[PDB]
């Protein structure tokens, strides 16, 4: 009806890229606005110490249906990051003490702890993609992961392991981490430890995440604008007026918001969003971590380590290793407040506090929690949030909402973002059609 564009997609992560592809291919005049000067959002492929790395999400699996189907469409295969026959497996406790565990007794103890925590996933989530199907799922949304970890009677090692694991998934202390979200994720993977674990940091996309992002946006035909942050959305005249941070207005029939939930405080809405959505906007989601790579010139082979929630290096892994190269450690930090990643002294310190005979040569980090356009990492639900997710998914007039947080399945993954983007495309068609179906 005379607007600048039929649809504006705010955000150039996987959710926005997918929503723009769906829309563009319908023939809609489509615009995507990205605040950063790069695409990918919470995925970001860079380079460090001579090789391609990934500062955010990177690992996918065929059991993740939405992203997998997109890899078929665009013909992208997988690249395997094996870690068979590990050389060292460590557990660092809340006290800072570091125990080298035998690798095979390591995995078996985490399996016991994991399978005990997810003992009722089959029953609670018969339909992982309808999380609130069973009533017990809704009751369990009054408990936290720690509430249950305390009722499982695990050994000392097993408790530290699962809590590190769960603290990483939460990017927070396990007492704030909603319990159902974890069970549903396990269900998505087939209610089976071996299957779920096979999706963990195992397979990467040929050509990186940015390759799939580009393949979607190229396919879409949409206009794409970088370094254009959106500061306000106003519903008016049968459409929307979108305001950028340099005060220029763009009109559209509809808007698809795909920005991370934690970044919504930076955007004004007229009229106001529903109270349910507002509650979500002020609560946010939990994760407040960072990503960190380190370069050691002391070959360490295949390595893994947990650290409980009171140490910084909660999830450590070997990205590569050569007698020449030394080792490059891939590390995910659950809470950035436990360590300043952009300080080479504290990093070298804490790294050596786990691998004492190490010389720290080079480091590269990404502080997702300090970045104004993520203000966090992967989606992590608090207690009682999953039960209210409909409030976050609901359309508000001619404003639709997507993003991994708003997905039903793999909400902490690329796949969730893709899923939410397919939904946004469908909701856009309903709003701009000849026969409607809201
Ligand atoms: C450290 C880390 C490890 C993870 N590992 C994996 C993994 O291995 N595998 C996996 O599948 N998932 C993983 N996850 C989670 C995952 O990557 C995300 O679920 C996924 O990338 C989310 O995409 P999104 O489109 O929903 O949101 P985002 O990727 O955050 O997209 C949001 C976009 O909106 C933009 N934006 C924000 N505010 C504005 C504004 N005001 N105006 C305009 N644009 C704005 C942002 O710049 C950004 O591009 C990881 C994530 C992180 C951070
Ligand atoms: C790679 N896995 C992710 C969860 C723990 C880790 C693992 C698995 C098997 C043996 N040691 C560590
Ligand atoms: C992709 N996962 C979703 C939950 C946390 C995230 C993850 C898992 C393993 C290592 N780093 C990040």
UniProtKB/Swiss-Prot annotation:
Q: Could you state what the record's PTM comment says about this protein? A: Predicted to be exported by the Tat system. The position of the signal peptide cleavage has not been experimentally proven.
InterPro entries, per this entry? Amino_oxidase (IPR002937), FAD/NAD-bd_sf (IPR036188), Flavin_amine_oxidase (IPR001613), Flavin_MAO (IPR050703), TAT_signal (IPR006311)
Q: Which pathway does UniProt place it in?
A: Alkaloid degradation; nicotine degradation
The prosthetic group or cofactor this protein requires is: FAD
Main localization of the protein? periplasm
Gene ablation phenotype (knockout): Deletion of the gene prevents nicotine catabolism.
Expression is induced as follows: Expression is up-regulated in the presence of nicotine.
According to the UniProt record, what class of enzyme is this? oxidoreductase
> For FAD, which residues are the binding ones?
15, 34-36, 42, 59, 230, 404, 413-414
Q: Name the Enzyme Commission number(s) assigned to this protein.
A: 1.4.2.2
User: Biotech: how is it used?
Assistant: Could be used as a potential therapeutic for the degradation of the critically addictive component in tobacco, nicotine. May decrease nicotine's circulation through its destruction so that an effective concentration is not reached or maintained in the brain. NicA2 rapidly reduces blood and brain nicotine concentrations when administered to rats at single or multiple nicotine doses relevant to the nicotine intake of cigarette smokers.
Any GO BP annotation: nicotine catabolic process
Q: What is known of its domains?
A: Ligand binding is accompanied by structural changes, including puckering of the flavin isoalloxazine ring and closure of a putative substrate entrance tunnel. The product exit passage is blocked by nine bulky amino acid residues. NicA2 has probably evolved a restricted PN exit passage to prevent its accumulation in the cells at an undesirable rate. Replacing the bulky residues at the product exit passage by amino acids with smaller side chains effectively increases the catalytic turnover rate.
Q: Which PANTHER family match?
A: AMINE OXIDASE, AMINE OXIDASE [FLAVIN-CONTAINING] B
The similarity annotation says: Belongs to the flavin monoamine oxidase family.
| Subunit relationships | Monomer in solution. Homodimer in solution. Forms homodimers in the crystal.
Spell out the note in the miscellaneous section: Overexpression of the gene has a modest toxic effect on cell growth, suggesting that the reaction product pseudooxynicotine (PN) is toxic for the bacteria. Coexpression of Pnao, which converts PN to 3-succinoylsemialdehyde-pyridine (SAP), can rescue the growth of bacteria by alleviating the toxic effects of PN.
Protein known as: Nicotine dehydrogenase
**Organism of derivation:** Pseudomonas putida (strain DSM 28022 / S16)
């Amino acid at each position: 009806g005379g607007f600048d564009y039929d649809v504006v997609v705010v955000g150039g992560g996987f959710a926005g890229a997918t929503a723009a592809r769906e829309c563009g291919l319908q023939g809609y005049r489509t615009l995507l606005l990205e605040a950063r000067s790069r695409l990918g959002g919470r995925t970001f492929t860079s380079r460090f110490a001579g090789q391609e790395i990934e500062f955010g999400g990177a690992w996918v699996h065929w059991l993740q249906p939405h992203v997998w189907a997109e890899m078929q469409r665009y013909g992208l295969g997988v690249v395997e990051d094996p870690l068979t026959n590990l050389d060292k497996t460590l557990i660092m406790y809340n006290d800072g003490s570091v125990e080298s565990i035998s690798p095979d007794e390591f995995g078996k103890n985490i399996r016991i702890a994991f399978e005990k925590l997810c003992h009722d996933a089959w029953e609670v989530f018969p339909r992982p993609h309808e999380p609130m199907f069973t009533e017990r799922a809704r009751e369990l949304d009054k408990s936290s992961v720690l509430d249950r970890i305390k009722t499982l009677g695990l050994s000392r090692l097993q408790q530290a392991q699962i809590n590190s694991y769960m603290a990483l998934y939460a990017g927070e202390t396990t007492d704030k981490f909603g319990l159902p979200g974890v069970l549903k994720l396990f269900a998505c993977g087939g209610w089976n430890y071996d299957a779920f674990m096979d999706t963990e940091t195992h397979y990467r996309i040929q050509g990186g995440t940015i390759g799939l992002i580009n393949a979607m946006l190229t396919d879409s035909g949409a206009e794409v604008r970088m370094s254009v942050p959106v500061t306000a959305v106003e519903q008016v005249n049968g459409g929307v007026k979108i305001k950028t941070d340099d005060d220029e207005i763009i009109t559209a029939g509809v808007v698809v918001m795909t920005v991370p939930l934690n970044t919504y405080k930076h955007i004004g809405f007229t009229p106001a969003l529903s109270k349910g959505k507002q509650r979500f906007i002020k609560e946010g989601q939990l994760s407040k971590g960072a990503k960190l790579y380190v370069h050691v010139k002391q070959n360490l082979g295949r390595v893994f380590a947990f650290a409980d929630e009171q140490q910084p290096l909660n999830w450590v892994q070997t990205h590569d290793y050569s007698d020449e190269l030394g080792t490059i450690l891939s590390i995910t930090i659950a809470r950035k407040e436990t360590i300043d990643v952009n300080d080479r002294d504290a990093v070298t310190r804490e790294v050596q506090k786990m691998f004492p005979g190490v010389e720290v040569l080079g480091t590269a980090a990404y502080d997702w929690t300090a970045d104004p356009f993520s203000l966090g990492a992967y989606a992590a639900y608090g207690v009682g949030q999953l039960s209210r997710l409909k409030d976050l998914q609901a359309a508000e007039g001619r404003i639709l909402f997507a993003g991994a947080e708003t997905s039903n399945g793999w909400h902490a993954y690329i796949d969730g973002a893709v899923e939410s983007g397919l939904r946004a495309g469908r909701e856009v068609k309903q709003l701009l059609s000849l026969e409607h179906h809201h």
